[PDB]
Subunit: 162 residues, 8 copies
């Protein structure tokens, strides 16, 4: 089970969201590491994490932050690996700040952005799977079964009065 | 060889999506560009998405505005990564576009980029970052692209 | 006869859409209710929309939240009137749902109602206003519904208890 | 025959609402068009709404901007389906118009469409989708409209 | 003497509008309270507005939420000053209420206050400021209300 | 009889606030107009508010944009009714103006009108409704203003040419 | 030695502004904390601002919600740096507070921080970053606060706990 | 003497940040101005921030648009006060810029000013209010600026002036 995804977040308070990303990676049998890496409070460590990611065997980085969420964009500035950004739902502005701070990157350094909150955490994992499946048969199979399952679940339960 | 499918809901999106295509050309990445309407050509859209993998595509980049459903619906019908570009809408300046693309519930992801030209450029660059993993020439091209933009700023520090 | 199809992207929408169904029952309008996911069951969605007219449906009421594509994609595949109900999302309180539904470009319309339960109820009542033109029992039932809600306000004019 | 009432809050709304009327013309749907202000002509508004059904109208399409009350207040006074078109306001780009029309509490519905010209067009097309059940030529005109818009995109795939 | 009409779109608005009525009581201003639904009782609404002046009302205070049409529609049918209170809506936190009331085009004004209880309270205080010119007792009651809220803060500088 | 004070934070607001003054002229209501800056002339703003009532004013109409503090701060310093006009700001289209005026907490009210010229016109008309109960000529003028605007619509029902 | 004035429009802002005071205490910075309402005590607010420099204050931190005018109005009446903290309003979650503080037109600046407790804490830290220039003990306290927060994240990399 | 560093993410920010520099010029405040991109020149940004205090800078004014990370990331790497100017973006009129700058979590502050030109001017004036404590000539210049702006309004009370 090779470690192919780095899941990183600006603070421990982002874990209730980011754990849902790790849960999907676990369910899909994808190897990952999870770490608190703060753009603001540990900037030098953030640069190091990004700089070394490729040589460490990582293929995708998933980064979550809230508020003025700079972590995903700053990582993306320092690696050519694909970076996925998860806007963590802020208590004040409901992740609207997080979302704009991540998605509105000017041209040159992209961050793939997903839905605010847990929906986006889970979707970032599934999207990472969608990238990794091209060179990992186990992942292709696990992702296909995931999608087959979610389709089957709706088809088998059509009546909402159940 | 055609590895990226660049699609958009209408011809009016071309002024945005052309910038995505310009980057793929610059990086030596094969692509096709096509108008595919989720609302006006729903059957073609389903067929496009269903056949993408077997036609050799590795990534789909989809642009739409307003109630922008094209990226999410293509994503529902292919296992390939789909990148969504919110097109700047005349009434709400892409606010509608962005929310309609990015706020996908858990299960079917769409990787979303900035509203407008910025997003169209970054989706192309992100596609390059997916494709570089198995293509040396693309890794080199993307590395050079980044060096070029870095150099442009470093060699032009005085804003006057 | 079944004249209205009430559909929703997920079972989590039933707490909103059951309020639609409650009004159709009160007005004696025939309907079916079903979970039809635009993202997880896209094929069934197309099939449902494609055949609704030949099945005898005259209106479709479709609820969805977040990036809410169900109403619009149904409307792309049927010439029947499609009524869209934006389900109140947990992050953005239905703002995403509303914009995702109402901001349809010219060519394929979706009639949109208020976010949440209010919209669900109103879609049912709007369906009644479409169907009363060829059904006298529905006309009477709607006239009575409107007369009763008017009486309720009039019967209790001063809200002070003391 | 006149089956659609197209009303608007002020003459300044006509650059938007004319786009509704153009689609109605194209589909062969008879209509009347009038300026009916909720705030400047409230009695005329109530009168218009009250008699619409008895005058043979089947659908009312109402456009207004800003604090846009015309659609909702018409809907309050007719049992006919009322379609609401939020006009693009100069200050807030129709966000006021949109919320003022779509956010009706339970009991009196207004079917709401996109802000601006897009919603004006879509209101016309939705009126057609209501009227097609009882009218063959309208059913035909709407089928042909949809077929032609689909063909136009299929014929023009290269941007 | 009943000089202020306090009206509201539904009974559920009473939790907000009660706060308006409380201030009018504290200032010794006569008022009436009534549920008047723009949408469910439109004829009653027109009759309320048409007869207000002849009934001796001087100010109307109208609360409503969502697509809040009551204040504007009353203002269209009376030349009396109409104060609007956007009631805090469950979905959009009164943003719909606020725009629906404040964004009246030129011709028929509605004086608009804060969303929720704050605005309800302030509409009552503003009614007092309109009426003060015609009654020394209301003028004194309002001056005293202000004097008291000022003294309450000066006397309590320490938040600790 | 100068009964209404029309004030604004800056000269750049005059294109909006002149429309308020135009209605007051049309209705025969006496007024004065002045540039009074809450941030650049705070002392003058306090003095203006403090002395309004003794100077004969009955209503103050105040326009400002951005972080629009003039209406609320004038209302803090006079017992007279204050009418606030959110001026359309260049960056946020008067969203900032509107929230900065209307969202006064309980205790000190400001009657707020629509963003821009619409609000400026409507503040003047609202001032007229406050004052009409005082001069039969103002009541008549306001009633005529409404009749004329109604007549423009009733006599011109067809938007098509 | 009292160098920072921490003021707020109402006592209900204390659960937010207390977090500012906690940081100033931890950094050893002298402060005073007072309720000063721009709308209910406008004269006191003018006098506070006018005499702040005389009283030895170097920075003023001002919190307010809703139509939040306290920071801008203090800034109009002192040349001392004024830091604005937008308090989280119950209706609009501090959006009104934020726009009312930050969108000051050119001429009278207010340094604005995040909505709510994060902004209260940051205003205190920012005040420290002003005072460190002429106070070596404050320079050292701030440097260590930042080293402490950095070390804590570095020592706790694992989000499981 | 150079006491203020004025930096901006891109040359397109100059039409806004030039207004900051104009005020600094008018007040007699020494500054330097440079394009420093958080995303395209991250190492240079870090270097600029790290060395600012030892180069004799006392205040940094940073402007950026969109997902505006420059001010926060500079603030993470210097103990000096950082002033943030949200540049008015084409799409979202600086709403993204503003949230990206002002919504910094606790620990690393950025003093934020109004969106656009107003904020650039105000950042310059706020820098002056920091520097006035140890620079007599700056104190005099800022006092004169405030007196003049007050005078201008007092001397032009009638908006009908022509
Ligand atoms: Cl570090
Ligand atoms: Cl097709
Ligand atoms: Cl689309
Ligand atoms: Cl399916
Ligand atoms: Cl959906
Ligand atoms: Cl209207
Ligand atoms: Cl009634
Ligand atoms: Cl209402
Ligand atoms: Cl002065
Ligand atoms: Cl102001
Ligand atoms: Cl006082
Ligand atoms: Cl305040
Ligand atoms: Cl660099
Ligand atoms: Cl940046």
């Amino acid at each position: 089970m090779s470690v192919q995804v780095g899941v990183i977040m600006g603070s421990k308070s982002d874990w209730s969201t980011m754990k849902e990303c790790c849960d999907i990676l676990d369910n899909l049998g994808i190897g990952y590491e999870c770490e608190v890496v703060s753009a603001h409070r540990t900037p030098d460590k953030m640069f190091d994490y990004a700089e070394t990611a490729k040589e460490r065997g990582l293929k995708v980085i998933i980064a979550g932050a809230g508020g003025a969420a700079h972590l995903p964009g700053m990582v993306a500035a320092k690696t050519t690996l694909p970076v996925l950004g998860v806007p963590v739902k802020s208590s004040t502005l409901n992740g609207q700040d997080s979302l704009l701070s991540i998605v509105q990157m000017p041209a040159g350094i992209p961050v793939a952005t997903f839905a605010i909150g847990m929906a986006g955490a889970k979707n970032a994992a599934l999207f990472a799977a969608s990238i990794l499946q091209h060179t990992d048969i186990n992942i292709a199979k696990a992702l296909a079964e995931f999608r087959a399952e979610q389709t089957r679940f709706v088809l088998e339960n059509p009546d909402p009065r159940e």
